[PDB]
Hints:
The PDB classes it as allergen. This protein is an all-alpha fold. The chain has a single domain (1-77), classed as EF-hand (Recoverin, domain 1). It contains four helices and no strands. The protein has helices at residues 5-11, 21-24, 37-40, 57-60.
Amino acid sequence: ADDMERIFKRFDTNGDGKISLSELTDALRTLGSTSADEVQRMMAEIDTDGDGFIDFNEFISFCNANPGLMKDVAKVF
């Protein structure tokens, strides 16, 4: 099982290692999420400097998985 790891490695298929948040924040609701806009407008204030990508540390900074935004999203689809 996995909460965010099931998504991280999923988006981490480019070649470098980071994931385009702009694509993640938009590739969440399409899976069944709900609070996608919560980061869609705060993906550059959570950690990302502005480039539009994240290695891992910056990716987990948003994956609080508190309310169940990530704890119940990697199993949805």
